[PDB]
């Protein structure tokens, strides 16, 4: 009955020193029944990364829609969309469905290719932008992630340290949530290399 907690899942993003990280769990369930162990919640359009938690059909639908819109953007503008701009596109798109919304918690992460700035933002289901220096959290274990991030985090971590910090925030938050976990994926993003790592985690 609550569309935001039928399927389960989480996304978290963090800034570091000239880098950003975005991670997500792999679970897709139908209430108590775990169904898929490979359901990834992070996508990318050029160098801009989007994580989406919530109702899985809307996660899929929004990915296909933002791929659609960013493809046309690139054809008309003749350049990849930047994270600041993409964040605005996400907001307008969500708010356009104000009274019949997508039941999602999206998260944008990327480095602006002109300025080199790391950039993260989160949104509510209706498009309200939450821009943050440090971290953004989303999904069924968001209380847990807020607790982990708010204590584990410190500014200016090097890529290999940020990896450890974000991974521990995600893993320990997920283990306190029945509807999150079943695998995880972490993206470490620097100005021009992106490393994607699958974490080992408890499978219950």
């Amino acid at each position: 009955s609550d569309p935001s907690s039928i399927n389960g899942g989480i996304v978290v993003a963090m800034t570091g020193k000239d880098c950003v990280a975005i991670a997500c769990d792999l679970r897709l369930g139908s209430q108590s029944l775990g169904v898929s162990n490979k359901f990834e919640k992070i996508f990318h359009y050029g160098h801009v990364f989007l994580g989406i938690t919530g109702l899985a059909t809307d996660v899929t639908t929004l990915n296909e829609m933002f791929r659609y819109k960013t493809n046309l953007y690139k054809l008309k503008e003749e350049r990849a969309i930047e994270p600041e701009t993409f964040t605005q596109l996400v907001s307008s798109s969500l708010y356009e469905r104000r009274f019949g919304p997508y039941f999602v918690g999206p998260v944008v992460a990327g480095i602006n290719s002109k300025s080199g700035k790391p950039f993260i933002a989160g949104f509510d289901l209706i498009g309200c932008i939450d821009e943050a220096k440090d971290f953004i959290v989303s999904g069924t274990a968001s209380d847990q992630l807020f607790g982990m991030c708010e204590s584990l985090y410190e500014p200016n971590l090097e890529p290999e340290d940020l990896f450890e910090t974000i991974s521990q925030a995600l893993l320990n938050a997920a283990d306190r949530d029945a509807l999150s976990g079943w695998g995880a994926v972490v993206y470490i993003i620097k100005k021009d290399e992106v490393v994607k790592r699958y974490l080992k985690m408890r499978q219950d």
Binding site: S30, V35, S36, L55, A56, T57, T60
Partner: protein, 195 residues
């Protein structure tokens, strides 16, 4: 409706679907085939709300058959499953949604791989080694978690299925009147007749 299962082995996808059709306290039919061939190498099983199930299945069938004729070509299992997902994702926000869950089993002739997609009425799609809709999944997923291997033969797949149907006939409260089993592989779609 009620029981539909799918297993993807080495070189085929197998769909098993119960034969019972029930209204109130009467089993009206015990040989119902809860399936439509969408194209020569793609099969779709379905369960859910009475009337909705067949209407949706046949509507998809008509669209895929129309595409086939227009392009003189067969859409890949992945392409068909995305088309189906989108129809259900539209439907869930309509005045009256289709209350239908589906499994799509197809053999992709370009990749030479069997493929199994599980899609619910919300348009929630997932590709899986094995799948189930309804209460079935509460027994068969853990059973298959244990007995399933990625490299099994069509024949090992059928035995794995017999295990599933045995458990369901033991623990499920309803009499679903056995299953019709269909195999999808490089040579198309065929029905096993004594199961």
């Amino acid at each position: 409706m009620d029981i539909i299962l799918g297993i993807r082995v080495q070189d085929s996808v197998i769909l098993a679907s119960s034969k019972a059709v029930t209204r109130g306290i009467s089993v009206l039919k015990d040989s119902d085939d809860k399936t439509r061939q969408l194209s020569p190498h793609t099969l779709m099983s379905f369960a859910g709300e009475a009337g909705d199930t067949v209407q949706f299945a046949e509507y998809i069938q008509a669209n895929i058959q129309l595409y086939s004729i227009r392009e003189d070509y067969e859409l890949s299992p992945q392409a068909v499953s995305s088309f189906v997902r989108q129809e259900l994702a539209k439907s869930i926000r309509s005045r009256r949604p289709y209350q239908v869950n589906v499994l799509i089993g197809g053999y992709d002739k370009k990749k030479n791989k069997p493929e199994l997609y599980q899609i619910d009425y919300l348009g929630t799609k997932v590709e899986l080694p094995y799948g189930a809709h309804g209460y079935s999944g509460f027994y068969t997923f853990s059973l298959l978690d244990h007995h399933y291997r990625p490299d099994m033969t069509t024949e090992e797949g059928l035995d794995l299925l017999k295990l599933c149907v045995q458990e369901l006939e033991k623990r499920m409260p309803m009499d679903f009147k056995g299953v019709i089993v269909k195999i999808v592989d490089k040579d198309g779609i065929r029905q096993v007749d004594d199961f």
